[PDB]
Symmetry: D2
Subunit: 313 residues, 4 copies
Amino acid sequence: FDTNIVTLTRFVMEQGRKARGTGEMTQLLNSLCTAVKAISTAVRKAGIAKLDVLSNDLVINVLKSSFATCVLVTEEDKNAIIVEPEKRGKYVVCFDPLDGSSNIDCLVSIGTIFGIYRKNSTDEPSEKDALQPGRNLVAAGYALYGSATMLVLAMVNGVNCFMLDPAIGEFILVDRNVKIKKKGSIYSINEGYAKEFDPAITEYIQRKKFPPDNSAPYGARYVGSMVADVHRTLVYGGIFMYPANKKSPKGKLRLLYECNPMAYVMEKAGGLATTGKEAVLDIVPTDIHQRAPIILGSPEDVTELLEIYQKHA
Amino acid sequence: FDTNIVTLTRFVMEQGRKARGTGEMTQLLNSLCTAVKAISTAVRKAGIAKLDVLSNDLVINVLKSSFATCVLVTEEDKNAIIVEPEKRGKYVVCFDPLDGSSNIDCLVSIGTIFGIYRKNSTDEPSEKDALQPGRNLVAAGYALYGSATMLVLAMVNGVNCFMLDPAIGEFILVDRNVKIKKKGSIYSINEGYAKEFDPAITEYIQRKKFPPDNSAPYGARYVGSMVADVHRTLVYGGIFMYPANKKSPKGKLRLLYECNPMAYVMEKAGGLATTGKEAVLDIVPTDIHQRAPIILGSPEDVTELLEIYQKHA
Amino acid sequence: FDTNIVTLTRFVMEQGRKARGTGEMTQLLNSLCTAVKAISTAVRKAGIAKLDVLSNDLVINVLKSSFATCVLVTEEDKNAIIVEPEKRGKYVVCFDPLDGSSNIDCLVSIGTIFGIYRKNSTDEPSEKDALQPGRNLVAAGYALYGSATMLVLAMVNGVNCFMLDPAIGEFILVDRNVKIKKKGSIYSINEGYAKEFDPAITEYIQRKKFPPDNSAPYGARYVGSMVADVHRTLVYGGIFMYPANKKSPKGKLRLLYECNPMAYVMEKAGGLATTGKEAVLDIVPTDIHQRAPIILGSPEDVTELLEIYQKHA
Amino acid sequence: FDTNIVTLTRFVMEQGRKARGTGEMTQLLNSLCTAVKAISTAVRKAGIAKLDVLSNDLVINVLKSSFATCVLVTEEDKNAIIVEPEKRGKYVVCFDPLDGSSNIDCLVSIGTIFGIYRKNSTDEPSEKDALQPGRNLVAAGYALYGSATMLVLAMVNGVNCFMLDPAIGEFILVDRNVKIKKKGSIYSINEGYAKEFDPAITEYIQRKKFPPDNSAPYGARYVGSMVADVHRTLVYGGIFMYPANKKSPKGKLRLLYECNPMAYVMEKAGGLATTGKEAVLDIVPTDIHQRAPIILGSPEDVTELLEIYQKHA
Ligand SMILES: O=P(O)(O)OC[C@H]1O[C@@](CO)(OP(=O)(O)O)[C@@H](O)[C@@H]1O
Ligand SMILES: O=P(O)(O)OC[C@H]1O[C@@](CO)(OP(=O)(O)O)[C@@H](O)[C@@H]1O
Ligand SMILES: O=P(O)(O)OC[C@H]1O[C@@](CO)(OP(=O)(O)O)[C@@H](O)[C@@H]1O
Ligand SMILES: O=P(O)(O)OC[C@H]1O[C@@](CO)(OP(=O)(O)O)[C@@H](O)[C@@H]1O
Ligand SMILES: O=P(O)(O)OC[C@H]1O[C@@](CO)(OP(=O)(O)O)[C@@H](O)[C@@H]1O
Ligand SMILES: O=P(O)(O)OC[C@H]1O[C@@](CO)(OP(=O)(O)O)[C@@H](O)[C@@H]1O
């Protein structure tokens, strides 16, 4: 009866028409969604019989065959992947094909994170085309393989969420223009690293548990899988932090394919994403595998931690 | 593990690149497949609770939103449907959204038949753009909702069959360049109309049952649903006939959306399609709802009936 | 989301609770449903992925694990299968695992036919337990892998249709206490064998194409798969006929697991099943793989052919 | 296509056949599987389509139709439900239909918790039949709607995991006689309530973040859904803790259908379930909706917190 179904394709296509463009993005996101549906199906009967290597080979293949990319950066590949000339296009794509895959056995939410840049140079494609600021992303998002499979997409016009209807094998648009809440009730961080944190994070944790103005204390959640913690942060409001510890002095989370996508999504939904020292999106990278500290969330909460970072400075 | 999956999109896109074109066909067939997956899902839980009217509204919508059509001809609509200017493209499409839908209750194979022309005039779109010879089709085919859902596609380069993988919601290419057999063993026709047939059909039926050279007699099958009878004829070889009776002097089957698609498919697979008087594809139409007699099948069998039509002439 | 789902299990249990007899039967049919779902899925992705052998082995394994059978007859195995003493129960199941399996490649409907007897002896299970007349059948029916999957189940109360809801893997009751039309307008027979047809048949078909009482001729329909044509005959009406010719001298369809299951379905829905001479249900079997002619369908139609048999003898 | 599928039904039946007891139990759990599949599907398309109310009604309808229950306790209904005399059997089922349902919107895992007692009386069913200590549980477990759907079922032999194969709608055995790690490296507790935590807890958490025996600190993990964290704790190891604070004075988790099902799973897999004072399984219930603290998980970890409880009393 739902004859007017807004699929992701119908959505992405109607928009690149306003860009007065060539169609490569619609083709790209199209291919990407073939990878996303196949990984979901795989995670759903994963047990009835690694997985993140299949995953990876599926995203690289659907992206080369789309004739819309030229440099592909993977979590799994040492170097950047340059698309053969016959299959080349203008977009650069950095992705993590199955984020949080250590946790596939404990059956909790995992996902694919991706960030798409445009190559702007006249030269032959290289990893340098990929070493751009995250503020330069044309589009970015993640797919979520939880109780339902969700693709959240951020572009210049906003943040939209599409859900996989498993009956038809199509992502359907279920929420338009997701704006995050100004202030939330949840803080998300691995507190098992408490001795390794700096003075400003420890002070912020302390007042969420023991509120200064004799208020109501913050709830705590940490799924242990970045996509699940950030999607909850977007839809429910709150703060999410994976700051620098001593196992990880530059942070644990990679910049081109975990911090920049999720930060692009957050800021487009009206939140902030910072390292405590600077905006994540404005960090200029040097190595495609470099890590970054990240504190992303509802504006008033991230701002709070930013001020605890200044007194301590 | 199947990282290199040839989907219909990957197939259609790689080909329009050789046409040095604009992308409207890939978009069109893409939209069409959203309609096809949704109708399949519907026929699969059709009972757990008309259907061909939903079907129709689903194909018209996915085709308008593709920005690749301008005139749409339906079995269900009196007139041709002209696409609003903002959503217009170059292709004309004639379809039957759910062929053989009287038979949905008896649970047998049904399907969607479509034929795509190109508008070649400079004028504003009209039904006249649709009144072309079937020899002028750029592409044509059918989707089959039987035990599996099959989309058979014919274009200038050949006949290819793609199957719906229901796990991923993607049509996969399972047979490349289907050529029909020279001569087959099966004849397909509704013999309950036997008193109404002409002398040449009656003579051809007679020698399939009672072979002149003391041979082995032809088997007989007639599902009663054009898509199922023609797909069997393509994949197994044989003859299929719905010739003029007295309930139907111009035949029962419509020309722009049942006879021309199936004839385009047949001739591209190397078979023949005739009315007994002329090639179906070369019939120039006058009304978008006009019917035609059709005898389509393996070459040596159709040719046989063509000669029984000449002695009788 | 229906909170009041009526599955095949809840159904059968609500008929057997008012009996104090078998919850052993619920176990058997329940097990038969797992195999039917596992075959349906395999047929639905068949081309993307011997089918009847793996189906044979699935129906035997799921049956032996019900703890409800002791003897099993299959189309594929020459001798009966006496189930292990440890896994025994009181029922004999006779099954054709994948009817019309030559018709799989052409995507025409296929199905699973099963008759279930009760072992009416104290002795050790032997194929003589399988050798009851169909009259002695406790439950019988079929599964049709069509545009939708349907399990039709005839027991002593009547016939009930169930449909596979692919979303949850359950057979849902969609038609209760089914009864066939007294008279239909379709006849189903392979007229390629017209030459070796006996004269009762030959006369009867001319009364269909050329009505004596000048009425409309019957429509012909022959899918070529027993389950598709016996199921169309049960819902629409009309006659289905596979009589004896010489190439198949005492008929083609096997008596224990194709003619008798269909004949018990037909008679518990008020239609008739004969061989032209006697009732199928009273023929006392001598080989497990013994054949028989079969004419079934609407009571006023079987009757009209039985009186042309009375005339030639 | 596996011909030797081991479903939950074939499993349970192969353990109960070597017992001469219940095939009444197979009926119950079988019915519980229909509801679990019907809820899984609803959660998987949730956003595209009160969920816990329709889930409540589904678990009650499918349960009353098993002819295996007489008393039912639900999170949603204040009084027990004494099943009709016509539909009775010997088992009491206590169930939480949709655990952590506030977490549905954020797409984090949710689940169904069920404990099953046997009515140990001759009398008329009354909620006093529901009021056994968990020690008296015959079968207990949960369903996790995660990246995959899993039914974990603990009976007297041990714990077994089953996974929903979405293709055929059956739960397939994927792990046999499960046993938890003696000691894990993760602790799970909501530290937003750190202020009102009692001192055994507060000390124990500092031994996790700051190890006395200078070892690596434990990793924190808290999904916020009981089934996700009790299931991660069973497969990985570690401790899960919901102790009493004042806002929820005698603990938050309801004893009859959340603490006791989880506690019987944990103990039949060799882990421990306590309240800090006593074992959960021996607490004699007084209200059906009575609450309790719960600390569960690896034996060497519960032990380490039980000795800090011995210290403060
Ligand atoms: O159609 P092409 O040329 O590929 O480019 C479309 C451009 O418009 C944008 C706007 O954010 O996406 P979209 O296709 O959705 O409109 C860019 O991301 C993209 O580069
Ligand atoms: O164990 P910790 O250090 O908390 O790491 C969890 C974080 O690491 C990531 C990185 O991929 O998962 P993981 O290491 O388990 O693979 C993120 O998804 C997640 O936010
Ligand atoms: O890309 P556009 O401009 O839409 O046209 C492609 C042309 O090539 C053909 C060749 O048959 O299809 P295809 O896209 O598969 O290559 C025509 O049917 C079609 O008109
Ligand atoms: O009953 P007859 O005259 O044989 O008609 C069957 C033919 O008509 C069609 C036309 O749509 O089906 P139907 O009339 O049953 O809807 C074809 O699919 C099929 O080949
Ligand atoms: O080709 P004919 O002789 O008409 O056979 C049709 C009958 O044979 C069967 C026998 O099982 O099919 P098939 O040979 O194609 O396997 C039945 O399903 C069907 O009703
Ligand atoms: O917010 P807190 O108090 O940590 O609650 C978590 C616990 O509460 C429950 C209660 O059912 O979730 P919830 O309130 O979100 O419904 C459990 O599933 C979960 O373990």
